[PDB]
């Protein structure tokens, strides 16, 4: 609704036809976060809620996040590549015996 009002026509009819592909990227990602990366090495809820206010307020009384360095052209290539997890990880069924 902004790109069609700013005058960008062809650059807004490109995003409308990338929308069903834009949803199947975050469908496969939400499969991975919800029901694949679920261990005792996941962050607890009473520490996950305090990751955003510690980034804002600048207080460093807790564990800092890990900062990665990407490039400018990497963001366009991230938009044209989704994730299809072919080989599900081979340590999943052995993991509750490893943590115990």
């Amino acid at each position: 609704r902004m790109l069609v009002a700013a005058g960008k026509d062809s650059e807004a009819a490109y995003f409308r036809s990338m929308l069903p592909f834009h949803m199947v990227r975050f469908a496969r990602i939400n499969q991975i976060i919800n029901e694949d990366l679920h261990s005792v090495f996941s962050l607890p809820d009473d520490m996950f809620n305090a990751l955003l206010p510690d980034l804002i307020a600048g207080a460093h009384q807790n564990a800092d996040p890990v900062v990665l360095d990407v490039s400018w052209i990497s963001l366009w290539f991230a938009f044209n590549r989704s994730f299809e997890p072919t080989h599900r990880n081979e340590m999943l069924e052995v993991a509750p015996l490893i943590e115990s």
Partner: protein
């Protein structure tokens, strides 16, 4: 000092070594001399036409060198004595070979590799059989005669102050016995003389290659500025490794070198692994293990996680068995040649192979790992013998419920159903009955490039000239209609009156592999059901993982370079957690003979085409034609030819049984063997120790029946890999259930006769690893096949895949390509296009570890006399070339010899020279490149001899078509009536339609002309055109020599259609701004400094290749079509789209393509691609002249999209075809800029603002786009956008 200078000073000394006295100057472009002939005089002496005594008078005066014919001096070559009579030498290598001399009374008559047999005067008929065998075994045909090869080594060894041992033993042989063989110079296959052993040509090839490999490595050690080669801590000189190996492989070269090959390749492939600190080359790519998008990083040294695994029961048994393969080999040479040398240098190296490290970041360790892989090519090509042995199917493995043989069959059968489904999802099925006769020639021709076959035919041609069988792919234009009939399909080949014949062809190092030549009555029923498997697996893009279920990505069959095609070996050998298991099957094809493969494959394709049951081919169902191709008794009983099994008896046994039981006529008896009628009376009285004669059967052993999966089948490379995947996936099952949790499998891939997995080994324990490794070898033994522990490797840091070696993330290269011999006698009917390939061959050789300065000198040795001696005429002293008349003073001592200048390797192409550059081999020199290379002020010391001889090059040879010996009315049009596309067949139904379509721009491709161009295209081969127009071109080559002028000119542009890379001289090119100063990283070490500095300052290719010109974009998309791409090119389709004017609609473009006999499935993409690129299309083409077709250039970053943005800066008002000639000029100039050590600058096209030099650019761009000769013929349209845009932009 320089390369061009000291190169020419040595080549001038070679010709004054090859000839006694010849005033060969540098400044002359060629030297012309005459040679004496006496055989063609003696035929004239038989007819009695004589004037003067020819024999004694000419020969005496030639040796006194005073006389000369027509001013041109006439002389003969030097003798075989004086090549090495400048110095005497005695050596132990010659004393071993004269001790390995074996008499007639010891030989085995059908050994696979020849021994050293003595020639004897008044020889018997069995020694005549050895003379027959020696003339058929050691054919050393090639580029250059072996005599002047030896003059090259003798001249070079005096300069480098080193005496190679191959030169030492030849000089020890020459002064004792004068001339071993008399080889001709016109053709290179003829030789008749034989001194003390028959193996003297194979000795002299082995001696020259030992001399070249020593001149390689001593020069290479000077290049890296080292005095020795390091192995861990100790230092060994590599000259000592060759000299101990040459003595060992002396008394029987073709058997000892074949068996030493397996311990040599295994020793390097287990060198670096197992040491406690391990240095790798870091690299990262996609999450698949078969990802090819690898980028590289620095070096680092990690601890070894597998430092304790190598004291197991597997690795200690593998090194012990490989020592025995050496020890069985050296003890064989102790007995044959009486010498007591035990190869002590290499055995000290291999005793601690798992412990001593190998670090690629030093030059000394990388050289030695590539040196031991290059030592195998010392004996030349392997010409061998194979005895025709049957299946002996009484010893192959029965299907037992103990072993897993029946599970191989059901898993082979399932994989065929899966491949036909995945090809059906990719719209590839078998061909329908409507399209049977029209796809028959499509698949028989392009699989003849894959696997060529045979059917006898009478190839007739008239203007009275008869051509023989001429076994090629145009046979089916004669009898294409009657091969698919009732009686031709119902014949089986177990009877004696009909059979098939094996054909033999040699390989570079291995044993000589025979090719089965199957009939068309068994191929074209086999070809129709193979088709969707062939095109689908050539799609190389796929993902390999066992938990993924798609067969198309795992099996690979067969962009140009092998570094970018095998980057997976460089990534996976760098990972500390990848433990590859790569097995190989010794005697693979003899274990395809079991019913586990063939009965499993046959019931797979039966159930797969069962939905296609209703459709029929002329009344034949699919079940009937699957039997005509394979047969329950066809391949189960096929009689195959070859040499027949021959026995050896005494003559007293022959004289009492000669007229009673000896016949002749059925099968052909060899030259020095006596015949016998049957084989039952042959083996009955067979035993003897004197073997005073040799017998051979003709009708008892009729032929040899085999049931073997033949290499001559159409389904050979596919069905070898489906069975390889079936034996692989059972190995996945048994290891996972016997040892669960250990040795997970991350990826797998299958080629024919090899198997490779990339596994993550879990547990590091020797007591549980041997439980895994024994379960692998027992599973492959339960599957019928046999694996060898001395060749199958399971090691973490070492990956090899289809003759591509990689160690610890770096490239260990090998160059087993021969330079002397070949697999067919090399004709040089196109000499200029020949050494263009020979330059591109040595580019691949120097990129694989050869020396730059030595490979330069071999190519300057070739370019003097590749095409010298092919003359039959005599010239005048007044610069005149004629055909000589048959006179008394013109037929004796009259054959012209043309020695070209050795600097013709740098005169650019189009000026009768070859385009190699003196600064680097991978750079070619065009016409504009010679202008820019002389313009750069630091090439004046190198290009000084090239400047004085630039235009003096005489023109070369060529083969063209002729109006004489051309057309014959009815050879192809019999099958051409039964074969056309349905678009084409409708045009031949109405003569009004064939008149409307010849008015189209089809032109030379009209439906009344497509048949005639199709027959003239098939007749480009050897025995019909080249053996017939050989008389024609000699009368036309004399015209080209006298009309050749010595004035030369660089021409901007080309003819009115195409442009060259010389379009870049329209503008000024400057060099502004420093880019960076970072040296790049690359996995391929062992490069020459002229090749290292290009790969250093310009990185490897990380992106995909560019789609540069329209012409190469067509040939990628014309490649999907099959027949026409061998006949029509990208040029003729682009003139049709030019003569059509503006392309008006897409549906109009597809219908003119199918009228040009193009497949319907591929023509729809042509019209979609071209009508998208219509608004940027211009009426221009491109002549690249091959500036990037070599292997080393495609391994570099240049000529990609990201290269142009960071190096080039062209003005916006340039059309895309003009941009392509600019960027192709840019990739050559930035290569030369890096090879000189000059600082890398971003080059920019420079145009000023004054109108006096802007108008000359404006006039030239209008002249190239709209030429004057094309507008008078009404071809240029004014309504094209890029023709209208050019006039307004630049002014």
């Amino acid at each position: 000092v320089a390369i061009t200078v000291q190169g020419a000073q040595l080549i001038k000394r070679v010709v004054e070594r090859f000839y006694p006295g010849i005033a060969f100057n540098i400044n002359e472009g060629a030297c012309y001399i005459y040679k004496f002939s006496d055989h063609i005089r003696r035929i004239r002496m038989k007819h009695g036409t004589k004037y003067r005594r020819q024999a004694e008078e000419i020969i005496r005066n030639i040796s006194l060198r005073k006389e000369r014919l027509y001013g041109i001096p006439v002389l003969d070559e030097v003798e075989w004595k004086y090549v090495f009579d400048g110095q005497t030498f005695q050596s132990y290598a010659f004393e071993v070979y004269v001790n390995s001399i074996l008499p007639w009374s010891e030989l085995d008559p059908e050994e696979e590799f020849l021994r050293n047999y003595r020639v004897s005067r008044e020889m018997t008929e069995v020694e005549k059989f050895i003379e027959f065998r020696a003339k058929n075994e050691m054919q050393i045909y090639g580029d250059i005669p072996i005599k002047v090869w030896c003059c090259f080594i003798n001249e070079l060894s005096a300069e480098l102050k080193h005496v190679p041992l191959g030169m030492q033993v030849m000089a020890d042989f020459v002064n004792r016995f004068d001339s071993p063989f008399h080889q001709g110079n016109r053709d290179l296959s003829n030789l008749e003389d034989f001194q003390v052993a028959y193996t003297t040509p194979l000795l002299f090839e082995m001696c020259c290659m030992e001399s070249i490999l020593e001149f390689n490595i001593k020069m290479r050690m000077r290049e890296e500025e080292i005095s020795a080669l390091e192995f861990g801590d100790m230092k060994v000189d590599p000259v000592g490794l060759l000299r101990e190996f040459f003595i060992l492989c002396l008394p029987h070269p073709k058997k000892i070198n074949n068996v030493l090959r397996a311990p040599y390749s295994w020793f390097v492939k287990m060198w670096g692994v197992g040491a406690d600190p391990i240095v790798v080359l870091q690299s990262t790519a996609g999450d698949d293990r078969n990802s090819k998008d690898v980028f590289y990083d620095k070096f680092r040294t990690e601890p070894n996680r597998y430092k304790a695994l190598f004291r197991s029961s597997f690795y200690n048994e593998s090194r012990r068995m490989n020592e025995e393969k050496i020890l069985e080999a050296v003890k064989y040479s102790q007995k044959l040649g009486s010498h007591d040398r035990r190869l002590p240098l290499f055995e000290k190296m291999l005793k601690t192979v798992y412990t001593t490290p190998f670090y690629p970041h030093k030059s000394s360790n990388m050289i030695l790992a590539s040196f031991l892989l290059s030592i195998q090519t010392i004996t030349g090509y392997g010409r061998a013998w194979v005895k025709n042995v049957s299946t002996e199917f009484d010893k192959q493995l029965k299907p037992n419920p103990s072993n897993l043989v029946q599970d191989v069959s059901d898993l082979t059968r399932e994989f065929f159903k899966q491949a036909y489904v995945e090809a059906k999802e990719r719209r590839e099925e078998i061909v329908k009955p409507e399209d049977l006769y029209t796809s028959m020639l499509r698949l028989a021709r392009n699989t003849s490039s894959g696997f060529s076959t045979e059917i006898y035919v009478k190839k007739r041609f008239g203007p009275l000239i008869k051509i023989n069988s001429r076994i090629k792919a145009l046979v089916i234009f004669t009898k294409g209609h009657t091969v698919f009939t009732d009686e031709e399909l119902h014949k089986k080949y177990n009877s004696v009156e009909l059979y098939q014949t094996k054909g033999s062809r040699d390989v570079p190092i291995k044993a000589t592999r025979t090719i089965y030549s199957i009939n068309l009555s068994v191929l074209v029923p086999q070809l129709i059901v193979t088709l969707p498997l062939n095109e689908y697996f050539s799609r190389v893009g796929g993902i390999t993982s066992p938990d993924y279920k798609k067969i198309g990505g795992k099996v690979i069959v067969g962009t140009g370079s092998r570094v970018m095609d095998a980057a997976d070996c460089f990534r996976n050998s760098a990972d500390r957690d990848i433990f590859t298991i790569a097995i190989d099957y010794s005697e693979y094809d003899t274990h395809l003979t079991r019913h586990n493969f063939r009965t499993g494959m046959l019931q797979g394709i039966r159930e797969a085409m069962a939905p296609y049951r209703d459709l029929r081919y002329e009344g034949y169902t699919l079940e009937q034609i699957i039997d005509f191709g394979y047969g329950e008794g066809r391949v189960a009983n096929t009689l195959w030819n070859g040499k027949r099994r021959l026995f050896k008896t005494t003559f007293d046994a022959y004289i009492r049984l000669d007229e009673s039981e000896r016949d002749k006529g059925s099968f052909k008896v060899p030259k020095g063997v006596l015949p016998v009628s049957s084989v039952d009376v042959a083996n009955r009285i067979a035993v003897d120790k004197g073997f005073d004669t040799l017998i051979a059967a003709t009708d008892g052993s009729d032929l040899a029946l085999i049931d073997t999966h033949l290499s001559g089948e159409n389904s050979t490379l596919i069905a070898n890999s489906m069975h390889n995947m079936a034996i692989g996936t059972l190995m996945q099952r048994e290891v996972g259930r016997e040892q669960p949790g250990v040795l997970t499998f991350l990826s797998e891939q299958y080629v024919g006769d090899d198997t490779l997995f990339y596994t993550k080994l879990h547990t590091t324990d020797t007591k549980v690893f041997d439980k895994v490794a024994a379960s692998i070898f027992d599973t492959v033994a339960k599957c019928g096949h046999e694996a060898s522990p001395s060749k199958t490797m399971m090691t973490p840091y070492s990956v090899e895949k289809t003759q591509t070696h990689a160690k610890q993330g770096c490239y260990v290269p090998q160059d087993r390509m021969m330079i002397i011999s070949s697999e067919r006698r090399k004709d040089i009917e196109d000499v200029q296009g020949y050494v263009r390939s020979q330059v591109q061959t040595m580019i691949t050789k120097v990129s694989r570890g050869f020396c730059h300065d030595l490979a330069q000198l071999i190519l300057m040795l070739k370019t003097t006399f590749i095409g010298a001696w092919k003359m039959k005429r005599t010239i005048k002293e007044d610069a005149m070339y004629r055909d000589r008349k048959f006179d008394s003073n013109d037929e004796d001592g009259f054959t012209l010899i043309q020695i070209r200048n050795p600097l013709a390797l740098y005169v650019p192409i189009g000026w009768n020279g070859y385009g190699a550059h003196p600064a680097a081999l991978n750079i070619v020199m065009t016409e504009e490149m010679y202008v820019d290379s002389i313009m750069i002020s630091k090439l004046d010391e190198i290009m000084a001899p090239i400047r004085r001889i630039v235009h003096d090059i005489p023109p070369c040879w060529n083969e063209t078509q002729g109006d004489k010996r051309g057309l014959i009315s009815a050879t192809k049009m019999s099958f051409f009536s039964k074969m056309a596309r349905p678009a084409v067949q409708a045009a031949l139904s109405d003569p009004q339609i064939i008149n409307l379509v010849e008015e189209l721009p089809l032109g030379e491709f009209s439906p009344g002309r497509i048949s005639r161009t199709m027959m003239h295209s098939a007749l480009l081969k050897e025995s019909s055109a080249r053996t017939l127009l050989s008389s024609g071109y000699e009368l036309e080559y004399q015209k080209a020599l006298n009309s050749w002028i010595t004035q030369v000119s660089m021409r901007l542009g080309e003819e009115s259609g195409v442009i060259s890379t010389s379009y870049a001289k329209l503008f000024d090119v400057y060099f502004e701004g420093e880019l960076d100063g970072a040296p790049h990283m690359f996995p391929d070490q062992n490069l020459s400094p002229q090749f290292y500095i290009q790969k250093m300052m310009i990185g490897p290719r990380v992106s995909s290749r560019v789609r540069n010109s329209y012409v190469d974009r067509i040939d990628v998309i014309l490649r999907k079509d099959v027949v026409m791409r061998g006949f029509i090119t990208a040029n003729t389709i682009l003139n049709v789209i030019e003569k059509l004017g503006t392309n008006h609609s897409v549906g109009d473009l597809v219908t003119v393509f199918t009228l040009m006999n193009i497949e319907t499935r591929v023509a729809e993409e042509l019209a979609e691609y071209m009508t998208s690129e219509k608004i940027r299309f211009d009426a221009l083409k491109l002549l690249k002249k091959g500036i990037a077709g070599d292997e080393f250039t495609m391994s570099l970053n240049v000529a990609t999209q990201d290269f142009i943005d960071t190096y080039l800066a062209y003005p916006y008002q340039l059309t895309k075809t003009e941009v392509d000639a600019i960027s192709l000029y840019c990739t050559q100039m930035i290569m030369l800029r890096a090879a000189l050590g000059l600082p890398k600058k971003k080059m920019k096209i420079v145009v000023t603002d004054d109108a006096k030099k802007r108008y000359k650019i404006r006039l030239q761009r209008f002249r190239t786009h709209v030429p004057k000769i094309k507008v008078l013929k009404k071809l240029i349209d004014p309504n094209r956008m890029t023709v209208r845009n050019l006039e307004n932009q630049f002014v």
